[PDB]
Design a protein around this ligand. Structure first.
Ligand SMILES: Cn1cc(-c2ccncc2)c(-c2ccc(OCc3ccc4ccccc4n3)cc2)n1
Ligand SMILES: [Mg+2]
Ligand SMILES: [Zn+2]
Length: 305
């Protein structure tokens, strides 16, 4: 059963899930139980599912099991602070989606798989890894005793899988820019309609980006350390680009590592700050994410000075 410190601090947007891997499954179950009720899933089926998901994450520096649970936690914090906005089915689906959203990640970008001519890039031409992550989710669900959605009607099953598919695909950052642009226009013109399924899908998309990027919304020591893990992957990809005979972009080129603070400044300006700004506009209770993001921006600026 969850430690008292975790019971309290799990409610903070900037909660960090700690270094004890065996505690993460219980942390996830607790979040499921709190958002979705204890009768939502059969406990034994749920536990079996969680452990098979864990098993199909790889031991890569960043896109790993810890990332999955962290992203799920941010979604939990959003849902908890926006009571009554999201349906029972959306809440179950999104938390499951977050847990599954990087399944079987290799630590390489879609761009790298394309340049490598990987079989997955022939199968899934766009949002390559994200299509795979969804494929893996379904495969796990179809294992004997793993169908946590077995108590839903066929219709609700199809519905929640579609919620999950859309949510997982939305974590393709390439899609974020267009999505956020549309949402910002809808907000400014007062045309955003949460009762409109297409608009709803966009908001959920933005939520997924916000959760996926949430390492930039932690307190500075956490954010600073996490940056090590993301660059470990990017620089390895850069190495691999060089081995293909292709000059990587500076972000992936370990030779350009001294420019990390400037690169971070660019990312916060172009992606992170706009993302959380738009999210807070639509869901005011998410403001702590934006505050924490601005704080980290300031820290990077301080590094530069
Ligand atoms: C999907 N996603 C999550 C993250 C993230 C970010 C921070 N903490 C955890 C996760 C990122 C991400 C985006 C940009 C980035 O660097 C931008 C950049 C650009 C030019 C550069 C030139 C030289 C050196 C470095 C340079 N970095 C690093 C990570 N993408
Ligand atoms: Mg991903
Ligand atoms: Zn992710």
């Amino acid at each position: 059963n969850l430690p008292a410190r975790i019971c309290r601090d799990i409610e903070l947007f900037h909660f960090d899930i700690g270094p004890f891997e065996n505690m993460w499954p219980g942390i996830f179950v607790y979040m499921i139980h709190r958002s979705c009720g204890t009768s939502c899933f059969e406990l034994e089926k749920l536990c079996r599912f969680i452990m098979s998901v864990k098993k199909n994450y790889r031991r890569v520096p960043y896109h790993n099991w810890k990332h999955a649970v962290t992203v799920a936690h941010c979604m939990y914090a959003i849902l908890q602070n926006n009571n009554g906005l999201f349906t029972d089915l959306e809440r179950k689906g999104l938390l499951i989606a977050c847990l599954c959203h990087d399944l079987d990640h290799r630590g390489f970008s879609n761009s790298y798989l394309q340049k490598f001519d990987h079989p997955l890039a022939a199968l899934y031409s766009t949002s390559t890894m994200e299509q795979h992550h969804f494929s893996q989710t379904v495969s796990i669900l179809q294992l004997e005793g793993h169908n946590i959605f077995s108590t839903l009607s066929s219709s609700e099953y199809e519905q929640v899988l579609e919620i999950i598919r859309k949510a997982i695909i939305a974590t393709d950052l390439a899609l974020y820019f267009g999505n956020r642009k549309q949402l910002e226009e809808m907000y400014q013109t007062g045309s955003l309609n949460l009762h409109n399924q297409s608009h709803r899908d966009r908001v959920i998309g933005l939520m997924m980006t916000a959760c996926d990027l949430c390492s930039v919304t932690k307190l500075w020591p956490v954010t600073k350390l996490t940056a090590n893990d993301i660059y470990a992957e990017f620089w390895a990809e850069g190495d691999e680009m060089k081995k293909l005979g292709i000059q990587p972009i500076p972000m992936m080129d370990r030779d350009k590592r001294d420019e990390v603070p400037q690169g971070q400044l660019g990312f916060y300006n172009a992606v992170a700050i706009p993302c959380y700004t738009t999210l807070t506009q639509i869901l005011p209770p998410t403001e702590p994410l934006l505050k924490a993001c601005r704080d980290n921006l300031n820290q990077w600026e301080k590094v530069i000075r």
